Amino acid sequence: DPALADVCRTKLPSQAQDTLALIAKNGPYPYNRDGVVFENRESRLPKKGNGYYHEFTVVTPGSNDRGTRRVVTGGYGEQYWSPDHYATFQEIDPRC
């Protein structure tokens, strides 16, 4: 599977960290599309079975738009950061 950078959880935008904490609490989430399956159609994340991955909005004050920033979870609690609606991913390192 392809090359993903690591990013320390503490180095993520405040809002990204907020999303990680909401995910850990099982919501309630701010958007209706929070928690929808991410199908990983570009194989940017490790290839897994159907429904392995889910996506959550990372709030962008930037406008009134929902925006492009996302966390994607895996089935065993993997966490990935994507600022750009899945064009790119980094693996979130829960240790730093």
From TrEMBL:
The keyword Membrane does not apply. This is Ribonuclease. Its EC number is 3.1.4.8. The record marks 66, 70 as: Activator, Transition state stabilizer. The keyword DNA damage does not apply. The lineage of its organism: Bacteria, Bacillati, Actinomycetota, Actinomycetes, Kitasatosporales. It is an enzyme of class 3 (hydrolase). It comes from Kitasatospora aureofaciens. One of its GO terms (molecular function) is RNA binding. The chain holds residues 68 to 163 of 163 of the full protein. Disulfide bonds join 8-96. Transmembrane segments: none annotated. Keywords: Hydrolase, Nuclease.
